[PDB]
Structure 1
């Protein structure tokens, strides 16, 4: 059976790997860009390679082994460091200078955590259909008895750090039932390890690919003709007997099946035209789910002016404006020679910032930095890097987020195949949507569904 796999990110490479494993080796993997890895992708910044996309193996040291972890920590030995959030309370900056009192912040953090813990008990009881779901925010109100959620500068940046920094949209839009507690952590463990290796976290994808695609003996570059880069799929026609796929350079390919691994943002954008058009139930499922954006703004400075030391890796800025340049990280461990800082924004701020110059963004950030460090002589960043994933037509965002309003059945419709067209990718991961491991496992699952129909002539889905 010939299978065309659209996209060579983690899930498309993972899906193809599993099909190969089932002996389905007549494969054609069409990747839009000139490389594989998708959302796991590094870039040079300031003399070092930093990750524009995924940066952590999240969910480590728990009861089950996160399948990505061994690859990273053992097989490839990708350099990495466990992130420690224990010292956050000593690192929350006032809008107008200096940090707040540690004990005061610690109390606010413990309050926020206990609300979430009560949230997990409610969640366990909600009807499985997802019909009684509510936003994380509704749960926060319920639990603290207030007509609003965190609303002071400190509580809002703690809230932003707890939720938005993980999910990339606010609690008020996020599904309680599907995120608190979160399976990644319940299953795999609470820790997260930040990868900081010149080869890039994407080395994981190259590794998996090389397990079934031919590579050059001296360079180890993949040379298998089954992988074709710079091929942007723009049309998929499918019928009872087969499928035909066309790329922008006009190539046309045929197969028994197609496995689509493009992001939910790409599916929301209409880059790929389906013929016939996908069914309405499928179209609605696609638009109802959220594709979030998480912008990692790196900055390079001619000298250090922030704290380094125990518990200094992560720090927050308590702006009176929610989500305004709030979550900071310094790299004394990851990039010691560097002088780099990383401030993370998402959602509304991400869209605003992608739409303006990097210089304008640098200037807003320098204003924030000077306020945080009024006692220092804060030099201007000599370099800044603003990833623009939402604007990139091959991604249209960074990762899915389960919103209040998408029920269990609607989420199944988002993954469901349509004739010979199958879907895979992080947004199709039943319990790990939004993660590299979620992409990895979604690839195997989608492939298996396809294997069933193709090899076991079991084609009915659900």
Structure 2
């Protein structure tokens, strides 16, 4: 009777939560697989994370699921190396990773400025805008100003040199999964607050520990708890939402009546659904503007064992590339993040070779793979990231129709499964509370 649209983490956890409360539900998934933008798949001779992959015990919702489904000890840290390669001014620079992390640490210290006054409770991101905010009016003028500034301009204005500017350019090409210059600096500042305002903790939480058994160990766990079969290959085309319940029409014309709808379809894919009545103009504006998730994630296999770390600013095909697995077949698997999905074919060896050639001439690519989420009709975006203005006038606007998903979370929004687990569960609680 409650229809959940989408069988990603948010819809799976919402279903389990409704099941706990004894509330009847049905999950409709457009694809022939569950997991959504988390997708552990058999590629290049390894289970590979085609979507998300890193976790941490400081992510409350993700960690509780890790504990629930037996993965407590099944995490492995990504490998480290001694040297990094970077491109500052149309030239490749090689230096120690220690020297790299010092420059990045100093830049993040400037990027985080204000986060202690903005986010004393980092799960209350809009507290500065609240009615009883008790800080100075200056802190109220800097918060709104930061929503309209990108994270690179904060570093340029502090007088950092071009090398550091190019390093943070590359960093946020990966972090903002697209063009960082159109992004909102407050995203970066909230990441810092959730990470005790320390760059090393931020990296520990988002880019260190991998699930040995993949995200699949978690989303199959949740689905394995459900007492109602997920309806795969059942795309939703129309949602009618009134005061008395709602109606959902599938792509095939099947009409489902429902007391409520929990819609986990990401912003990049909401255009496939006709909403009757139409969504509010403020929400439609965000849907038109889309995310800042125009990038891509690649997996590259090269000959030999090489501990590699490369940074390249926009418009590089890939901005951050790092070794992740050393195969017993004398090869290394690297992961890369790039700002523009249309400038790279994730499955073309020549394009992957062009990526490695950004920094080196002695490394040979033998395979490459990736799923282009932006060109995936049911996603339309990688992980959700914020354009200018979307920290205070974006994700919070989505409020018997409820939107749930990582892109609307209070905490680790968009970038982490933690946000999907948070918002799926709390949205189910909204439905539970209304029926009680």
* Residue aligning to 1:452: 433
Which of 380, 383, 393 is 2:377 aligned to?
393
Describe the SS at the equivalent of 1:362: helix
Which of 399, 403, 409 is 1:429 aligned to?
409
Describe the SS at the equivalent of 2:52: coil
How far off is 1:285 after superposition? 3.8
Structure 2 Cα separation of the partners of residues 276 and 261 of structure 1: 18
How far off is 1:43 after superposition? 1.9
Which of 194, 200, 205 is 2:219 aligned to?
205
Q: Structure 1 residues 208 and 131, CA, compared in 2 at 3 Å: closer, same or farther?
A: same
How far off is 1:278 after superposition? 1.6
Q: Does 1:266 align with 2:269?
A: yes
Structure 1 Cα separation of the partners of residues 242 and 324 of structure 2: 53
* Residue aligning to 2:424: 443
* Residue aligning to 2:130: none
1:296-327 CA-to-partner distances (Å, cap 9, x unmatched) read 222234x31x53xxxx3x511456x6544332
Structure 2 Cα separation of the partners of residues 233 and 112 of structure 1: 45
* Residue aligning to 1:100: 95
Describe the SS at the equivalent of 1:172: helix
Moved more, 245-254 or 287-296: 287-296
Describe the SS at the equivalent of 1:344: strand
Q: Check conservation: 1:157, 1:323, Cα contact below 8 A.
A: no
Structure 1 Cα separation of the partners of residues 32 and 330 of structure 2: 29
In the superposition, the TM-score normalised over structure 1's length comes to: 0.77
Structure 1 Cα separation of the partners of residues 185 and 92 of structure 2: 35
Q: Check conservation: 1:108, 1:155, Cα contact below 8 A.
A: no
RMSD: 3.2
Q: Structure 1 residues 454 and 384, CA, compared in 2 at 3 Å: closer, same or farther?
A: same
1:307-355 CA-to-partner distances (Å, cap 9, x unmatched) read 3xxxx3x511456x6544332222346x5557233242333x323225x
Q: Structure 1 residues 47 and 351, CA, compared in 2 at 3 Å: closer, same or farther?
A: same
How far off is 1:288 after superposition? 4.6
Which of 71, 77, 82 is 2:77 aligned to?
82
**Structure 1, unaligned stretches of length 5 or more?**
215-223, 456-462
Describe the SS at the equivalent of 1:382: strand
**Structure 2, unaligned stretches of length 5 or more?**
120-134
Q: Structure 1 residues 233 and 16, CA, compared in 2 at 3 Å: closer, same or farther?
A: same
Which of 119, 130, 144 is 1:131 aligned to?
144
* Residue aligning to 2:128: none
Q: What does 1:315-326 correspond to in 2, within 5 Å?
A: 315-318=309-312, 322-326=315-319
Moved more, 5-14 or 118-127: 118-127
Structure 1 Cα separation of the partners of residues 220 and 386 of structure 2: 29
Which of 157, 175, 191 is 1:166 aligned to?
175
Q: Check conservation: 2:28, 2:232, Cα contact below 8 A.
A: yes
Q: Structure 1 residues 403 and 35, CA, compared in 2 at 3 Å: closer, same or farther?
A: same
Structure 2 Cα separation of the partners of residues 92 and 209 of structure 1: 42
1:43-65 CA-to-partner distances (Å, cap 9, x unmatched) read 222111101000101x53x5xx6
Structure 1 Cα separation of the partners of residues 390 and 173 of structure 2: 19
Q: Check conservation: 1:168, 1:346, Cα contact below 8 A.
A: yes
Q: Structure 1 residues 155 and 129, CA, compared in 2 at 3 Å: closer, same or farther?
A: closer
* Residue aligning to 1:66: 60
How far off is 1:276 after superposition? 2.1
Q: Does 1:175 align with 2:175?
A: no
Structure 2 Cα separation of the partners of residues 407 and 195 of structure 1: 28
Q: Structure 1 residues 360 and 336, CA, compared in 2 at 3 Å: closer, same or farther?
A: closer
Which of 335, 340, 343 is 1:352 aligned to?
343
* Residue aligning to 2:238: 235
1:370-399 CA-to-partner distances (Å, cap 9, x unmatched) read x51x4x4x43x3321132110000000111
Structure 1 Cα separation of the partners of residues 309 and 166 of structure 2: 14
Moved more, 382-391 or 27-36: 382-391
Structure 2 Cα separation of the partners of residues 430 and 168 of structure 1: 20
Q: Check conservation: 1:289, 1:406, Cα contact below 8 A.
A: no
* Residue aligning to 1:459: none
